[PDB]
Structures are given as C-alpha cells and as structure tokens.
C-alpha cells in the first residue's frame, strides 16, 4: 500500500524447453519500440505455471517490445 | 505509477508448444501503441488452464498491444 | 519519489540446463537498444521459478535488449 515505483509483473512456475527449443524468459526490448523518456512505469501482470516446448519451439515468456527482438521470419543468422 | 497496485492479471495454468510453433507468453507492446503511456493500472483479466499448440502454431498468452508484436504479419518477404 | 532502489526484478529459482544447452541469467544490454542506460526505459519484473532446457537449447533468464546480445535472428519455417 502506496507505491510510486514500477508495478506489473509477469510469472511463471515451471519452464521445460526441450528439443531445438529456444526460450526467452524476461523481457525483450527492441531500439526501436521503446528508448528511455516518460515513458510506461506500469505494465500488465501475467502469470503461468508450467510451460514446455517440444521440438523447434520458440517461446517467450515475458515482454516483448517491438516483436522483433525474441521472434523474426528469416535472417542473417551466422552464428 | 503512483497508483497503488494494478488490477488485471492474465494467467495460464499449462502451456505445451509442439512442433514449430512459437508463443509468446506475457505482454507484447508495439512502439505505435504505447510510448508515454505513463499509467496503465487497470486491464482486462484473463486465465486460461491448458493450452496446447500443435504443428506450427502461433499463441500469444497475455496481452498484445498493437496487434503487430507477436503476429506480425508477412511484412518482410524480401528475407 | 525518492529512491535509489530500482523496482524491477527478474527472478529465477532453480535452473537446468543440459546438453550443449546455453543460459543467460541476468541482464543482455546490446549496444543498439540503449548503451548505458538513458531512463529506466524497462524494468519489468518477471519472476520465474523452475526452468530446465535439455537438447542444445537457449535459455534466457533476464532482460535482453537489442536481441542482438545472446541470440540472434533465425531461420524458422513459419513466422
């Protein structure tokens, strides 16, 4: 009771990636979607519990800012 | 922000990606949708208990602002 | 108001990671999305508690900005 701070938290309980699995825990943040200023100090909470991946699976679990951080079509992947 | 907790949660109890598929659990904001939006402490509650995506799916689980983070549409065919 | 302490944690309880299988715990800064700091443009808080990848998997507990830092872009069949 009585906060001024940042409030909005996203959960999850268990994560199983298995199998060309690729996961994102956290947050993402593109350059483009979000630098700095007045910006959001407040975001909505999710929360799950188990989450698994079979098989070439890409899963965020977080936030996504500008939705070309963690996910993309095709690129110059030369690593 | 100043406003003393944020109402509004989503919840996922089970998730199970198979085969190709991504998801995207948690919040996706767009730039175009939310740079100042300095506030935001009431939104809508969602849960879900299982779902399951099977053979190149797509789910997003939470809130997706913009409509252009997680499905982005064919905008790049040129990679 | 006044405060030297940053609202904002990514929590992981219990982590494991097995074969050929890379974790990033913490925080991924790319140079791109913000180079020391400008604002908390994010500090969402993400709290997770049991992740395991096993399979050549990537697993990234934290915050990413850039998404340029511990992955990079794919080749995945479908957007």
Chains 1, 2, 3 share one sequence.
């Not at 909005?8 to 199998?19: L, P, Q, V």
């Not at 909470?45 to 070439?56: A, L, P, Q, W």
């Not at 951080?69 to 110059?76: E, Q, R």
């Amino acid at each position: 009771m009585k906060i001024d701070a940042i409030v909005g938290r996203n959960s999850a309980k268990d994560i199983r990636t298995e199998e060309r699995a690729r996961v994102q825990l956290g947050n993402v943040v593109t350059a483009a979607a979000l630098h700095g200023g007045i910006r959001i100090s407040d975001q909505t909470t999710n929360s799950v519990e188990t989450v698994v991946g079979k098989g070439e699976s890409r899963v965020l679990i977080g936030n996504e800012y500008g939705g070309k951080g963690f996910w993309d079509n095709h690129h110059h992947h030369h690593h």
